[PDB]
């Protein structure tokens, strides 16, 4: 009743946690990992406040789930420790509320490893539950390929969705590029939409690609774009990118 807060999470598919950290550590330098009944979450912005990441690992995907705690984490440090886990390892995280440290346990299905690192003491934004004008579901491999290709031509991508399909366009010093995909590649278009975005940030979002074979891109003329990768069958990483406008 008067007990100090405690977090203990056991994830059988430890590699998901490795992939999650790789997805975000270069976008955000440090962030809190928040603990709730819904699950293990994180929300943070990049330093220029142009992109936002929202991550959720639902409680149903942890073989053990004990938890409103926050853990301030240097993400690259956490990634240095998670990199020492094998791809098939079971991973446990354990921490106290005002605790000084977090302990990671990597357990082989013999080998048992304990890694312990210091925590930090680190204001969220509210994500409106809005409806979008167009939604595209496509192979995450193909989206990653497109962003990388266009970024070798220019710095800015125009994404447009019309009756014809979804187009990605760039122009730069050496020329111009347009990529059109017709309607798997699923397009649901409430209204046509066209928006410009920095390819630098899109390229960073595609580091989530090993989490999911499919990516979802939600567009509205009045909202940041949302690029979402499913975390196996137990959660998501959503990236929000503020557009470049007239």
């Amino acid at each position: 009743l008067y007990f100090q807060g405690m977090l203990e999470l056991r994830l059988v598919q430890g590699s998901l946690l490795k992939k999650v950290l790789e997805s975000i550590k270069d976008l955000v330098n440090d962030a809190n990992f928040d603990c709730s009944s819904t699950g293990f979450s994180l929300q943070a912005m990049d330093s220029s406040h142009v992109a936002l990441v929202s991550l959720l690992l639902r409680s149903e995907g942890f073989e053990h789930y004990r938890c409103n705690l926050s853990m301030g984490m240097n993400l690259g440090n956490m990634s240095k420790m998670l990199k020492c886990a094998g791809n098939d390892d079971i991973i446990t995280i354990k921490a106290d509320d005002g605790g000084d440290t977090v302990t990671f346990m990597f357990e082989s299905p013999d080998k048992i490893a304990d890694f312990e690192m210091k925590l930090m003491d680190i204001e969220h934004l509210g994500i409106p539950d809005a409806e979008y004008h167009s939604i595209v579901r496509m192979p995450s491999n193909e989206f990653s390929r497109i962003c990388k290709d266009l970024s070798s031509i220019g710095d800015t991508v125009v994404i447009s969705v019309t009756k014809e399909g979804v187009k990605f366009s760039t122009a730069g010093d050496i020329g111009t590029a347009n990529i059109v995909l017709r309607q798997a590649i699923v397009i649901e278009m409430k209204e046509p939409v066209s928006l410009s975005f920095a390819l630098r940030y899109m390229n960073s979002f595609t580091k989530a690609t090993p989490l999911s074979d499919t990516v979802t891109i939600s567009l509205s003329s009045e909202l940041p774009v949302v690029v979402e990768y499913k975390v196996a069958e137990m959660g998501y990483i959503r990236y929000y990118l503020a557009p470049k406008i007239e």
């Binding site: 142009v50 936002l52 204001e123 969220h124 934004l125 509210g126 409106p128 503020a242 557009p243």
Partner: peptide
């Protein structure tokens, strides 16, 4: 001349 907007131009501080 496109201008890069900010996330805080769209979402508020909860």
């Amino acid at each position: 001349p496109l201008v890069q907007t900010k996330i805080i131009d769209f979402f508020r501080i909860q």
